[PDB]
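Hey forum,

I'm writing up a methods section and want to include a predicted complex as supplementary material. The small molecule is flavin-adenine dinucleotide. I've pasted the protein sequence and the SMILES. Can someone with a working setup run it? I'll credit the forum in the acknowledgements.
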Amino acid sequence: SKVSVAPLHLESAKEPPLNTYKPKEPFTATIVSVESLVGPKAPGETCHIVIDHGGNVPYWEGQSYGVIPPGENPKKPGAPQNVRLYSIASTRYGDNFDGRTGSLCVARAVYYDPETGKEDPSKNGVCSNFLCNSKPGDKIQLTGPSGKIMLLPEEDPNATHIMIATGTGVAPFRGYLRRMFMEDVPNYRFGGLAWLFLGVANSDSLLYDEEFTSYLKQYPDNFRYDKALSREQKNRSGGKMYVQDKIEEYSDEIFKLLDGGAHIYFCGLKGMMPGIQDTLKKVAERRGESWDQKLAQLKKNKQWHVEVY
Ligand SMILES: Cc1cc2nc3c(=O)[nH]c(=O)nc-3n(C[C@H](O)[C@H](O)[C@H](O)COP(=O)(O)OP(=O)(O)OC[C@H]3O[C@@H](n4cnc5c(N)ncnc54)[C@H](O)[C@@H]3O)c2cc1C
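Reply by user p_vandermeer:
Happy to help. C-alpha cells for the complex are below, copy them as they are.
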C-alpha cells in the first residue's frame, strides 16, 4: 500500500519553485537528523541529512538546495562563504510525508596527501564536513531551490526512465522512485518502467539499497535495479566494474528503450561521464549505429538529462 502524504496543495503549482531564498537572506532551517549510509569498508563517509524547512522552502523532485556554510569566504574577507548545491534526495513531501522536511545525501570530501596518505583537515571540503558533522537542532542556511535539468517529465505516466548514478548521484533518483512507487499521489500514477543503475566502490558503499531492493518485490513489472561495485567486481575486459559496464550487459534492452522514447538520466561526479560515453560509443558501433547521431537525436527529443559535478 502506498503511503499517505500531505499536503495535497503541493501538487497545485504548475511551475517549479526557483530561488525562493537567495544568499543575502537565506532561510534558517534546522537539522532533524544526520546518519551514516555506509559500512566500515567504504572508502569515505556518506550521510543522509534530514532538514526541517517548515514548508517555507518547497521544491520539486530533481531540484537542489543551496547551503551556505558558516564562516568567511577565504578569497573575499568580509564576505560569506559561497553556496554549495546538493541534489535533494527526498520527494516534495519529504521523509516524514508532511511537506516539512527535505533530505540530502552528502559525501565527506577529505584530503589525503597523495604520497604519504596523511590526512590534512585544513584541506577537507568545508560544506560537506559541516553537514556531516551536524547534529539535531543545528541551523542550516538554505537557499534555492534551484535547477530544472533533472525535473521528472510526468506528462506520460507510462514513460520509461533509465537512471544512471554513481555515489551521491543516487539522490534525485531516490526522490523519483519514492514518488513513482512509495507515496500515494493520486495525480501521478506511474505505470511505466523505472530502471536504476548504481555504481559505487563496494558493497559497504551502497546507498539506500534496502529501499531499492524493496521496490523489486513490490513493483516487479515496473522497476529494475542493477549495481556495479568498482573495487569488488571486474568487467568483461578486465577493468574495474563501473556503471557503464552494467549498461553494456543490457546493451540491447536499453538501446531498444531509448529508441522507444525512454528518458535517460546521469547524476554524480563528473568523472563518471567519459567512460559512459566510451561504452555507449562501442555499443552503438557493435550494432552498426553512430553514437554521435543517436546522442544528437536524444538531445533534440529532450530525452537526455545530465547533472554531474
Ligand atoms: C547541482 C549539484 C548537485 C550536487 N549534489 C551533491 C550531492 O547530492 N551530494 C554531494 O555530496 N555533493 C553534491 N554536489 C557537490 C557539492 O556542491 C560540493 O561541491 C561538495 O560537497 C564539496 O563541497 P565542500 O564545501 O565540501 O568542499 P570545498 O571546500 O568547496 O572544497 C572543494 C574540494 O577541494 C578540496 N580542497 C580544499 N582545499 C584544498 C587544497 N588546499 N588542496 C587540495 N584540495 C583542496 C576539498 O577537499 C574538496 O574536495 C553537487 C554539486 C552540484 C553543482
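Some notes you might quote in the supplement: Residues 64, 84-87, 105-107, 109, 111, 123-128, 168, 171, 307, 309 surround flavin-adenine dinucleotide (CB under 6 Å). The CA atoms of residues 284 and 293 lie 10 Å apart.
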